[PDB]
Every structure is written in C-alpha cells, then in structure tokens.
Design a protein around this ligand. Sequence first.
Ligand code: TRP
Ligand code: TRP
Ligand code: TRP
Ligand code: TRP
Ligand code: PHE
Ligand code: PHE
Ligand code: PHE
Ligand code: PHE
Ligand code: CL
Ligand code: CL
Ligand code: CL
Ligand code: CL
Ligand code: MN
Ligand code: MN
Ligand code: MN
Ligand code: MN
Lengths: 457, 453, 453, 457
Amino acid sequence: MNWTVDIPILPPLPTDLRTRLDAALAKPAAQQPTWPADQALAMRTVLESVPPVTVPSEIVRLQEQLAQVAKGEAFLLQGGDCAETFMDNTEPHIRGNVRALLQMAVVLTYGASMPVVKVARIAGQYAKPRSADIDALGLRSYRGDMINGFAPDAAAREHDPSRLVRAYANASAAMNLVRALTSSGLASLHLVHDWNREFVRTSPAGARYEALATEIDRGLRFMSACGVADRNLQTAEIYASHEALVLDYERAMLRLSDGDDGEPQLFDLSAHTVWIGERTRQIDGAHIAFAQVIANPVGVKLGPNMTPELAVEYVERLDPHNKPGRLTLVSRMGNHKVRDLLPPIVEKVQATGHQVIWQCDPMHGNTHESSTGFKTRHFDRIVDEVQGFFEVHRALGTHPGGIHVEITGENVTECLGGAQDISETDLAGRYETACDPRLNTQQSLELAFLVAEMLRD
Amino acid sequence: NWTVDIPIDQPPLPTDLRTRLDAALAKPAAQQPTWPADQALAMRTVLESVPPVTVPSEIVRLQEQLAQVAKGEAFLLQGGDCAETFMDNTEPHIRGNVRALLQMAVVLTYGASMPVVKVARIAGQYAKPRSADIDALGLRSYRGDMINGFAPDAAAREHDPSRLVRAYANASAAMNLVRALTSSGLASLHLVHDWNREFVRTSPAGARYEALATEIDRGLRFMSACGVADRNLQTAEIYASHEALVLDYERAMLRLSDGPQLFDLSAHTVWIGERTRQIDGAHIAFAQVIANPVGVKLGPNMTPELAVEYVERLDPHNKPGRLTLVSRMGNHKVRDLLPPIVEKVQATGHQVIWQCDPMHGNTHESSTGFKTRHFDRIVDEVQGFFEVHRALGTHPGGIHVEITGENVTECLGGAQDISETDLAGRYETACDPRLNTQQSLELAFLVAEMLRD
Amino acid sequence: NWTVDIPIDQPPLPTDLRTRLDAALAKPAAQQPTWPADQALAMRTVLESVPPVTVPSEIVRLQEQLAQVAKGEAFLLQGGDCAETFMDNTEPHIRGNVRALLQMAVVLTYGASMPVVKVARIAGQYAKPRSADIDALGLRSYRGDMINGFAPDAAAREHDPSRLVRAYANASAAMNLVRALTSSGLASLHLVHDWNREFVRTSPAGARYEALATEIDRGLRFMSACGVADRNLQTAEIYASHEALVLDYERAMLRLSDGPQLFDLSAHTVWIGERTRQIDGAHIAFAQVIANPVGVKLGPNMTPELAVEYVERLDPHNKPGRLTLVSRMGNHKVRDLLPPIVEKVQATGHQVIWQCDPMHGNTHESSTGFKTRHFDRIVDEVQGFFEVHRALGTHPGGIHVEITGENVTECLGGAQDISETDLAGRYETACDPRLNTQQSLELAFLVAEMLRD
Amino acid sequence: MNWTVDIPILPPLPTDLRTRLDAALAKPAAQQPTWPADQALAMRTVLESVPPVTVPSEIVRLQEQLAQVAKGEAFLLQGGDCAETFMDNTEPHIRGNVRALLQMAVVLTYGASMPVVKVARIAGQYAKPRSADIDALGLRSYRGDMINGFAPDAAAREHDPSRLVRAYANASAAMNLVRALTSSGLASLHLVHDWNREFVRTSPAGARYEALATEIDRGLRFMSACGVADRNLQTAEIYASHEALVLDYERAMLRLSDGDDGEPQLFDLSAHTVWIGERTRQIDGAHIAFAQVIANPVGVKLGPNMTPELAVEYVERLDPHNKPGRLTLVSRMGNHKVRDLLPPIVEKVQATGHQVIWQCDPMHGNTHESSTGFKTRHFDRIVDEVQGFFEVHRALGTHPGGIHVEITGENVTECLGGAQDISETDLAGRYETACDPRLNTQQSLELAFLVAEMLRD
Ligand SMILES: N[C@@H](Cc1c[nH]c2ccccc12)C(=O)O
Ligand SMILES: N[C@@H](Cc1c[nH]c2ccccc12)C(=O)O
Ligand SMILES: N[C@@H](Cc1c[nH]c2ccccc12)C(=O)O
Ligand SMILES: N[C@@H](Cc1c[nH]c2ccccc12)C(=O)O
Ligand SMILES: N[C@@H](Cc1ccccc1)C(=O)O
Ligand SMILES: N[C@@H](Cc1ccccc1)C(=O)O
Ligand SMILES: N[C@@H](Cc1ccccc1)C(=O)O
Ligand SMILES: N[C@@H](Cc1ccccc1)C(=O)O
Ligand SMILES: [Cl-]
Ligand SMILES: [Cl-]
Ligand SMILES: [Cl-]
Ligand SMILES: [Cl-]
Ligand SMILES: [Mn+2]
Ligand SMILES: [Mn+2]
Ligand SMILES: [Mn+2]
Ligand SMILES: [Mn+2]
C-alpha cells in the first residue's frame, strides 16, 4: 500500500543568493533523472519544509575539524555502503556499518597519533550515475533508490519522483539512529576496542595484528593508570555524507543559516559534507556551480585523466577564499597508476598556496569483473593503492590526509582476498551490494591495521 | 488533491515474549482506531523493521535519572505541544519548542538546586482520545494525525492506517533534529540564559523576575570564576515522550535489547491517559510489559486504592522512578484530593515520581467560544501541589505542561494579560490550549520560587 | 638562658648579573641592620645554597595571574600578619591565617564574579622599619625577628645576623605547611564556605550578611546541579609575600632560573615600603633587577610624577601586572589624593595593579594606650578607593590587609563592637593592629557588595 | 657560627593515648643515641611546637592509595638516598632525586598498566643504626647527621642532641621544595618522559630500551589524539619517608588529629610513612610498640633470618584491625636467597586473611666490599633479586607490590655494572654516599625499564 503526504500550502532568499543559485542550476547538469518538471517541483516543495538531516553549526564544526586535517593535524576516514537501499535501511545494517567505521577509527587514531575525522557514507547515498542508459539485461539502468528500483524489470526501472521523499524519510531515519548510537554507547572507545580484540583473536591472520592490538590495549590502560578524565572516550562524532548527484534533492534540502555565527549562507542540509563524482564534475556544469554556492565542505573525485591544470581550476573555483579543508580532492587512480599520476597533481596544487585535503579512494580505480560474472575488487590492489598514495605524499613532504572506502559491517562476499581468502567462487554466497563491491567488516578492519602501519612507518 | 502517495514494501520477537504480549493485548483496549485489521497488520509489519526512534541504553539512562527524581535528588520537567501535527512538524516549530523547554529548564535547575530531567512531548504525540462520537460539525471526531485529518471534511476523517507510517517518519525526522540541536549549540546554558535575560528585559512583568535572573547570571559567572571545566554546560539531554494510545503503533515499535527486556522504542517514556487507564485494560497491560519508565494520569475521580493497584501493577519489583503518578486535579481540588492518594501510595514502600499536570483539570470555555485555561489557575495548581508535598514531607517531583515556542494566544492571562478577545489572533493548537513561550518561561520563574521557598 | 645554639657550616651567580647587582646595591639603603659585614657575609653564604622558599615557575604563573588582575579580569587579595614572629610560627596560627584568607576569598570571588589571586603576608614578614632611634623604654627599637628580639631587654635588641638563617628556616617550614594545607583539604571551597555559614549564623551582624551567604550557597549548589567536574573546587593557590627590607636576606635568596632571569626565591612577590622607596635607593634598584611581581606603597605624600617614575623604573618593558601600586591614604584622603595619581599613571599606557591598603593610613592611639584602627575607617577607605576607580573607569584591582585567624582585640569596631576597653584582652600583634578573623570576614562581605554594586 | 632557637614557654592527650605512648616508650629501644636526658628533653620541647613536615589528611590519602596497592590495583615505588646529609640538602640534589624517582615512575606506570604510589626517602633520612659502636678507623661510628658527623674525627663523632633540630629544619626545607616542584612543573608527564627519551638516545644500552620508550611515547600521543582532559598529567604526588629510628625525634613530631575525619589518633608528622629496620624490629621493643601506636602506614624490613611465624606476629601486632595497606613487609634476602626464603613467609601471611603490601628491597641483601675497598652492590644482583621476587609472587598468585631502592639523580660511582659498566676502579671517581652505595640516575632508570618488563611478562 501507500502512505500519503500533503503538498504544502518564508523571508525570500537574499537577492544575490537567489541569483547565484539560479545561475548555477541553469548550467547543464549530467546524470539527472528524467521525470516530469511539475511532479519534480511538487516533490521539492514537500522537501523544502521538512526538518533537515543536519544543521549548520555541525557543518561549521566539521569544517574546523577538516581544516586540522588539511593542516596535517588530523586524518580523515570516510566509508560505508556504495549504495544505501531502502530495503536494507534497518537497525542492524546501520549499527553494523557504524560499528565497522568505528572499529577502523580506533586503529587509525592510534596509528596516526592524531584525531581521525569520522565520516560515514550514509543517510542519503541513494543516487548513482551510469555510463550506460541501457544495462546488460537491456533494461533502463538502475540509478539508485532515489531514482528507480533495483528489480530487473522495466516498470521498476521507471524514474519515480516520489522516491525523492522516500529518500529523505529513509535518510533522516538513519541519521537519527546514527546520532542515538554515537551518543549512547556504541562509540565507547573501550567497547569498540574489545571488538577489535575479538577480531585479532578469531581472524585467520590475527597473529599478524596482535602486537599492534596489544599496544593499543596498553595505551588504553595507560590512560586509566594516569587518571585521565574519561568522558571524551565515551562518544565519538560520526558525520553524514553522500555523492551530491540529484540536483532536485540537493536544491530542495538547501537552507539559509541564521547569521548568528557568520553572515547568512546556503547550506545543503541533506548531509554534512558532499562530493562530486567523476561523471558529474564538468568544470562549467551545474554540479561544480552548485558546490560553489553551498557553505558545506566538498570533495571532488579525481581519476586517471585528470591534469594538474584542471585540478588547480577545481581548487580556484571551489576554494576561492583559501579556507583550509573546504576542498578535498579524492584521488582514485588504480594501484598501478597512483604513483605515476598523483605526484604532478599534488605539486601543482601545493604550489597554489591552498590547503586541500588529499584523500585516497583506493576502491573505484581497482574494479574488475570475475570469471564468475561478479563485479569485484582485489584486496591487495586496494591496499597497494593506499601504499602508493602514502609514498607520493612522503616523497613530496605533503600530508596523506585520509581514505575514502566502501565498507559494511556485514560479512558479505564482494571483494576478493583479505585474511579470509575470499575466492572467485566464494563471491556467490553473500554478494549483497546494490552497486559496487564493498569490503566486508573483517576486510575493512584489516585495511585499518595495514594503514595504521603506513602511518607508523 | 494536493497529495503524493509513497509506496510501502510488502526475524520476529521471541516466542515466549510474543506469548506474553498476546495475552496482555487480548485485554479490551479503549479509544482504538477503526481501520481494517489486515491493513493494520500490513502497517505493523513495516514498522517492525524500521530503525528505532530511541535506543535501549538511552532509556536505561533515563530510568537512572528518574530514580534520582523519585528519591528527591532531581526534578522532572516535561513539556511541549498538546498535539503535534504533521504539517507543523517543521524545523522552526520544533526548535522553538526545544528552546522553550530549555529556558524553563535553566530557571528550574537554579531554583531546585538539583538536576532537571528534561522530557519533551514530541516525536510522537499524534493521537488523542475523544468523548464525542460526532463533533459539533456532525463529523467523525479528529483523533490525531496518526489516525485521521484535522480538516473538517468527511474524507479526511476516515481512519487511515497508513498514517501509522507517516507518524513514524515524522517522529524520527523530528527526533533527528532534536538530537542535532541539543548536541550542536542550542542547548548551551550560556546561550539559553541569554534568551532568558532578553525575556526579563522586554517582558511586562520582567521587573518581578529580574532579581532571580541576576542571581542565575551571578551563579553562572561564579562557575567561570572558580575555573570549573565547562563541557557539561555546552549541551543537554532532551528525552522524548507521548501518550501511548495507538496500540497498533506502540506494539510494532517494540524491540528486545541486546543483553534482554522489552522496550517500546517509539519514545523514551510514555504515559497512559485518563481515558485508557482501565486497570484491567490493554494499555495498562502494555505498560506492564515494557521496560520504559511509564506515567499514569490521575484525575479527580481517582481513589487511593486504585492509585495503589497502579503501583502494584506497574512497579512490581520496586524500581524507583519506574512509575510516575501525574496529578491533574484542578487548582480548586488539588489540596483536598491529592493528600490521601500520596499517603496511601507512600505507605506501600514504593518510590514513585509525583508529577503535577496543572493543565488538564483547569480547562474552561471562553464566551468567545475558545477552549482555554487561566494562567493563574495553572500556577495555583502547582502551588497547591507543592503545599501538599511540603505538608507530607514528600517530594514535589516535577511538572507536565503544554507549551510551545510560538507566540500563540491560547491560554488567558500571564504577564501579557491575554484576554478573551486576544484568543482569536493566534489560536493554533490542534487540541488543548498551550502556554505560549512567554507564559511558559513565566511559569518556570514562579515555580522556581516555590522550589526556593 | 633557655636557648639552644645550632651550628652553621662554614657555584656563584654569573659574573655579568653579579656586576649588575653590585652596581644596584652600591645605592644607599635605608633601614638596614647594623651587624658586622663579615658576619652578614658568612650568613649570606649559608643562604646562597639553601633550598628555595619558592620556585621560578610558580612566580611566572603568578605573573600571568596578576596580568589578568591588571586587565580587569581578576581581583588580588593579599593578607596576613603585620609582623610574623618566630615564636608564633606555629601550626594553629599559620592554619588560622590561611583559613581567614580563604574565607575572605570565597566571598570576594562570588562578589567580583571573577577569579581572586590569593597572596598571604607570610613565610617571611620578619623585618620592619623604625622611625624612632630609641623606643619609649629607652631601648634600641625592635626591628622584626630577622633583626633582633621583641623582648624589651638590651641583649635581645642587639642586631644578630644569625637571625638571617633562623628567618629562612621559619619561612621554609611555614611555606611547607601552607602548601600542605592548601593541597590536602583546607582549601576545599565547600568546607571553607561551611565555615562562612557558621560565621553568618553566630555573628552579631550575621543577619546583614545572610542574603549573600545564601546566594553563594545556591551558586555552589548550582554547580553540582549542572554536573561540572569538581577537582578545581577542592584546592586553591596561596602565594607568599612580604616587605622586601633586609637586603642581606633578599640578595642571598636570589637565584637564576634554568631557562634565565633573576628571581628572589624568598617569596613569590615582595613589596617596598613607604620608608625605603627612595627612587634612587637600593630597594628600588633591587626591585628593578628581579623578575618577581613587585609592589610599592604609596602614601599621602605621593605625587603623580613620582608614581610615574616608579612605573618607568619598575615596569620598563610594559608587562601588565608586573607592578602593583598600593594605595594607603587614610579614609579621609583617598577620594582626593588618589585620582590624580591614577590619571597620570594610566596616561603612561602601562597596566599596573591598583590595590588598596586600607590599614596603614588609618592608625590612631586609643586613650587606653594601644595602637589601633577603626573598623569603619578601614571599610570607608576601600569604599572610597572604589569610588575613585568607578569615576575614572579604571579597575579597583585588589586589597592589602592585616588579618589573623585568631580572635584578637586589636582593631576597634566591627560586628563584635570591639571597644577601647576590649583592646587589653587579647592584643597580641608584635607590630600593627590586625583585623581578627570575624572582622576580616566581615570586611570581605562588605567589599563583596562594593564589587556587586 | 651558630643560629639560636628558644626553648618554648595544649589540651592534654587523651588519657588512653598518653598511657599507650608511655607504655610503648618504656620498652627497650635499640640503636639510640647516648646524649643526656635533659638536653634531649629541651630539644623535644622545641620540636613539639614546630610546623609539621606532613599533615594527617595526606597520611589518610596515602593510606587509601596503599590499600589499592595491597589489593593488587597499584604498584609502590620508594627510593632516594641511603642517607640524606645536611651538607647535600640543596636544590640541585633534591630536584635531582625527585626527577630520578619520577623518571622511574613513568616507565613503571606504563609497565604495570596501573598507578604507581611514589614515595621518596627524603626529608628525614638522617639516622642509621650500626652493628658496631667502633668503626674501622677505631672511631665512634657515624650514625647519621641527626646524631653525629661524617667527619672521621672523634669530636665530630660525639652525639649532639642539637642535631634533632637541625634535622627537622633540613627536613621541612626539603619537603617544601619537593612540594613546590611536584606542583609546578617537574612532575609534568610530558617533560619527565622527554628526559627518558634523552636517556634512551644517549645510554650505552639505549637500543635495548628504545621499543618500550617508543610505545610509551605513542601511548602519550594516543591520549592527546583522543582529547583526554590533561591536567592530571601536569602534577604527581611524592610522599615522604624514612627509617623511624631516633625515638626522641619521632615522639616529638607526634601530633593528635582533629577528629573531623576519624576519631582522634596520634600521627607521626615527621613523614607520611615510616619503616622499622632489621636491627630495631625486636618484637617486644620500643620501635614496634611505637609503630603500633601511630596512625601512619608503616613497614618492616624482613631479612634472611625471618621465619613465617615471626612475620605473622608482625602482621597481627601492626595490622590488628585488618586494614589493607597499613602494613608493608619489605623483603631483603639477597638475590641468591629470595626464591627460597620468601615463598613460605608469603604463604603463612596470606593465610592470615590480612592484606599486606609485599615490597622488594633488592639493595640491602646484595652488598659486598670491592677489592678497591669500597662498599658496593652489583647491578645484576639487585636486578636478579627483583626478578626472583617477581617469580615468587607469580607462583603464588599474590601481588608483587613494589620496590624500595636507594637511588640518586647524580651520576655517582657507587654500584658496579649497569649499561655504563661501572668497574671496581671506576668507584673511585664519584663515590659520594654518606652510607650505602646508591644506584646512580642512569642505573635507577635502567632498573625501571627492566622491572617494567617483569610487570609486562
Ligand atoms: N572522542 C574521541 C575518542 C573516541 C571515543 N570513541 C572512539 C571510537 C573510535 C576512535 C576514537 C574514539 C574521538 O572520537 O576521537
Ligand atoms: N548539561 C547540564 C547543564 C546544562 C547545559 N545546558 C543547559 C540548558 C538548560 C539547563 C541546564 C543545562 C544539564 O543538562 O543539566
Ligand atoms: N580553585 C578555585 C576555586 C576555589 C577552590 N577553593 C577555594 C577557596 C576559596 C576561594 C576559591 C576557591 C580558585 O582558587 O579560585
Ligand atoms: N598524575 C598521574 C600522572 C602523572 C603525572 N606526572 C607523572 C610522572 C610520572 C608518572 C606519572 C605521572 C600520576 O601521578 O600517576
Ligand atoms: N511533515 C510532512 C513532511 C514529512 C514527511 C515525512 C517525514 C518528515 C516530514 C508530512 O507528513 O507530510
Ligand atoms: N525503508 C522502508 C521503511 C521506512 C519508511 C520511512 C522512513 C524510514 C523507513 C521504506 O522505505 O518503506
Ligand atoms: N619557630 C621556632 C622553631 C622553628 C625553628 C626553625 C624552623 C621552624 C621552626 C624558632 O624559631 O625557634
Ligand atoms: N643544610 C644547611 C642549611 C640549612 C639550614 C636550615 C634549614 C635548611 C638548610 C645546614 O644545616 O646548615
Ligand atoms: Cl525548475
Ligand atoms: Cl471505545
Ligand atoms: Cl637609615
Ligand atoms: Cl623521657
Ligand atoms: Mn561505489
Ligand atoms: Mn492536552
Ligand atoms: Mn603593618
Ligand atoms: Mn641503606
């Protein structure tokens, strides 16, 4: 059946912000759903008065934490599903993904010797681009639950604007849980580290990670021995992110800030931070213009065809004021290319004077199709791209700022390798992703161990 | 018709607890909606797998804080809209209401000299009883947005079980925002006190309250002067609550904690109303089975003996703070009716919270046709509630009020001297008349003196 | 003769700082003792290698706190005995005096709404000037226990340089105890406030002070109610001070910090008296060379121009809080004499602390023969000091008083209404009349209102 | 020359405390100086109204911290000079000894994974017993500066009661400094650990201790990474101790407590805690009786002739109320005997039901005379006694509670071995002790490293 919401019935935007927003959205937009303009407008009119998913003073705080990242005084961890679905938007799946990110944070905080800014891909990662409008079954392609349905039939693939509302309801629901969990006990550093201790005990490669787990453990005991005040160990902040892709959803989630802090700006309150993907980063297109008008922190994906010069253009358009950490540039090159392609981008951007975050995405450049027909990534390539991203920064004297991974708390079978030795035949058991293969819980924690050893190197 | 339809798609609680629940839910349930069972079932099935509004470790913490209230070492402040509506579940309304709680809370904490457990009527108060089969307009009565529409038209008033899911979405989106605001600066004690100072400055009776405002300011500066660490001044906990009325909604929102007890995860704490508190009815049998702290409204027809049976039913293990008895008597009846009830419950050896709802027994109709409440009657029920406890050496434990951040004209009186003619300007409640933001801060100050006195 | 002799046994400061010191110390020094140079030297040699009374990082912290006082963001409270004696350097006396500071401090912190830098006249105040060549009894005048004996007999009054070492031992043993008491529970704010409550309860004017006592109590409970972390309520810092008078003692106690500047490590902060503040004399040239915060007493003969030369000499680098100008004018003269001095020093652009000593210009002789001070005159000098600063928009920075924990009868008046006849009962000071414990708490309350007013 | 103090001119002691104290001091007392009774009494009358060196609420606190020790929830470190002197009672020598104890504490806190109760032998360790009244030069023996002079001449050796006063003045002076230093910066955990980092860098055996120093370092950085409240890292408490030997000094430093906490008792305020030595622990003698009347925590030295049965008698006389941590029993057996003699003492005392602190003194049973004529101890024996004290407790299931060592911050040449390889010829350079050989600063820190590895084992 259906539930039903009302299309509703206040000071207008500041004149310059109206002008600028309309000039942004007048530009060409790639990868947009194709539904009618009237039905879209009704849906945006619903979203324009819902309670936001985030609030501006959180975005201001995240921006300050990311400036520390940009200055080399913190490390950025971002991860969660490749594609959230409505049907898997459930308490166990959310807790599971929050717990996996947390588990990784413990180990990276200890390896980096500095705070880790924890950013979940969650509460709105419901839209994807596609290179092909017709997929391999010859159906109109799945573009994520905010657009159409996974089910491999033609009605299910029709673009349905009512998905904008269901996507918001599902997002704000998740966010409520993520906040409940982070403040009420899941994020206690003691509990989360006990889980890491249970992984080291049962993992097939646990003997390799025992020494570092033991050190963290004596580190934690050292704290209670010296009598530190411990409430800061009880809770952590998990922020929300997703690809800003569907411009009808992002424009309708825009809100003007109150001016008490800074003079009023437009924040996208569908998320704390958002990024712009490889297929939508046209320099003069609507997504880059949009990013330029919102106050949030933003990132741009940079793949193997990126030039140093285009990089610098992104930095000048998106960090026009030189605000450390407003712009993250998220390298995804493939492990076999990172060490060649990244260095001259980093040099040209470092010489601008701006302070970007350098972030490694070691997933999206390392995808292949298995003999068994599944889209998969090999753990050792994902690892090796991070290795090589660390080598580039070390050679340059610049900061390996963080990683951006697709992970889950579930024990799926989606990426090959790890300690578990996920084989091509194994992929059949629990291939559950609605899009790209994610590291399972064990694989994601193994990678934090390995990355903790790069941070220590 | 200016709507948009949102499609619904389509492991169970344990057998032993399901067997206990179905036994309790075979009891007759008053005031339930009349939708088809098969549609109710469908909608319960959706809600049995949605992410929860609250989590068990939050409720367990609330129980600890409420235990401290029961024992005379904390004060319970519960307030917000009489009735939430889906169309007024907006960011400025929700903020406004949190703001008004928080401002009352600063003044009450200072006046009590102890912590204040801050519980909003919010993120689910979407259902109400009715006495009237047919309202004045000859329509089926409005029952709250979880049941039907406010709109005085026959189609709006048919009972729609899909509203179960709309209520949930609106409840979680609301709770998301309440969490976000109370963690990220709205619950800064300094900033909330600054709003209290601007009220004292511009209020018409602001002269009367200036002295206490200045003492608070100087109690604040004293903290800074002594160098205390300040992060616990930066944020506050606002718990969620509503009347537990729709048993289709409340049972679907049940979850087992991870150990393992049954919690209702639609709210932190829920109460049973004056019309559904049958000692052998399902609402009571539901309150019995859940581990959340629970409240029961006790109006002027209550007997000591019946208030005891509530205690034996709802607090069988003698957990202080688990049960809150909520007096609502009328200002003219509190001093007489409440003492016997207190004496007899105290004598059981159980520690209940004694909370005053000075709103619901003090409602009258104005010559201009609006349902309304005098400000002075409301105050004087609290004053009396206080006298009762002082006389008996028992704890005046908290209050339960209907308030909003908005500058409505719903209750008469207060410093603004809302008159019978002012009622029409902004009377916006979908149900009972609320204190507006000014009247609710004024009531906090006046109660803060009863605590000091 | 009821004494026991304790034998004395027997790498230097750097050449460049020793060359600076000897240049400054070639200046004439008033009020110095008349013992043989060779004996002075011997005794300086002992004191140049003894463990220090204070350490440089303590003084550096004091300078930071005193900077905050200079800038109008803290208040300076300095008090204790006019003259310490070796035979009254006992555990109950020392505790009593710390106790009396700390109680004044609670009330001043609340009344100021900012932190209070707590500096005792203690652990070295063992030397005094004299005007009189020959006292009334026809004896050489007593000069303080670091110089000679109080005992009115010719042998006691000969200047004994071995008293340099006795002073040091008594100073360090005293400071040991002050550190121990302020770390281990005597400086608990709660417990100190409890003493303040028992004073309000038993004092004859306790009625007058009850309201502020109750506000403090409620500002305290408010902290607990808000859950602040409390370790900074458990202890307090009490710094040491005395008049820097015996240059043989003060120069021997010099040390280089470890980097490197010169500190006098006989005290945290030291002041120059009204009789030794010659602009070209050695006391001033000594204050110039040390890095400690310093004070200069400014009596009714001071000129604006001379108070400026103190600023240029003693605060050459413009370090706020480094220099404290200590007004002591008489209550009848403060309102007239002080404003010009403030205007002219302010105009230099330097930030000095402006501290009131309401004791030394308000001393009179009673018909019963005792040196005494009216309580009301003392209060009214502070009141005036306050009016002066308010008028000019400058900071009334602190006070400097002579107080003890004991229930002496030295100053007239106060709530106890000490009369000319009461003076003989317990007049025990070896020098000037002190506020007793009651009168000193009474003065804190009354000053706390000048701060609130 | 001389300085001069006055022999002075209040509620009498509670009748039972008078009676008990006099009954204690009526018993025979070994090792007491032999000066006239009238001159003694004058000196005690001076001491009876001086400001105490410690106060009762500190002793109450230390007792609570030592009960945690007794329960196995903390570790006790006690050390400083074998014999303080008046002439070396100077700022550098005191800071030096405080710094060395601190440096050791950092490493033991981290090794134990639990707090360390820091107890200095300081501010009154001015008296020693002697087996011989005539020494090897045929002079009346040196008994410590509270009794007579080190100088090897007969006048200097006369017993001089005025030394009771000079001993107090010197003690309270030191204590004032120790308190100044602990609260004002010397005891910052960051500074003290930087010093440990400089030792590991320059020590000849530094490469052996680098790994553990590095772990502590990442542990400390882990704390700032997680944002702990850090004032508890700024300061530490150093307590005062010495051998309670001279009964004229200890009786005159007795003070009655105020009753606000517990009902009034006699505390010895010359120290926080005191111990009774091998030569003065006669079961029915004045020192054991004295210890029984004061409220302080106490210890008794136990050497190789101790029986399990006599041990239990000490426990029943000195911990009559079963108060954990009131009684420490301080094993000194010699490294070659500890593993044989300690176990049956521990079993008999454990079976009483009382909770003593078990403390290792690995110095006093391990002393020998070198070919070069110096009293010396070999580092490897001192180490091996601690090793063996750990082995006894591990085998029993009981708590290796702490160590009691003689150390200094100076780079003296008094104990053979260590990383520095202090040879018999080396002892000549800087043999500075007025009594037994102390570990120098480097040797004391090496031993903390080694003991930290026993705690980790
Ligand atoms: N609050 C700190 C420490 C912390 C608490 N829980 C955590 C879980 C993982 C990592 C760190 C933490 C932080 O978020 O950094
Ligand atoms: N966190 C404390 C104090 C506090 C912070 N913000 C507040 C706002 C209102 C009342 C109290 C507070 C509490 O909830 O009690
Ligand atoms: N430690 C704080 C508060 C405090 C503790 N004890 C006190 C005693 C008196 C005055 C203040 C205090 C301070 O010194 O300011
Ligand atoms: N205050 C804690 C931590 C600490 C501070 N400084 C230290 C120096 C050494 C060891 C520990 C510490 C303690 O004493 O245990
Ligand atoms: N309150 C609005 C919009 C909304 C829908 C779902 C969740 C939150 C808000 C409605 O019910 O139509
Ligand atoms: N994920 C489910 C249930 C749900 C509805 C609304 C909000 C949150 C969850 C859906 O989309 O139907
Ligand atoms: N105050 C006494 C005792 C004393 C001596 C030395 C130090 C401390 C106290 C005196 O000078 O005689
Ligand atoms: N240690 C020296 C100096 C000293 C005297 C008094 C107290 C402290 C130190 C002495 O005994 O003479
Ligand atoms: Cl449009
Ligand atoms: Cl019914
Ligand atoms: Cl002269
Ligand atoms: Cl005797
Ligand atoms: Mn992906
Ligand atoms: Mn109502
Ligand atoms: Mn004086
Ligand atoms: Mn020894």
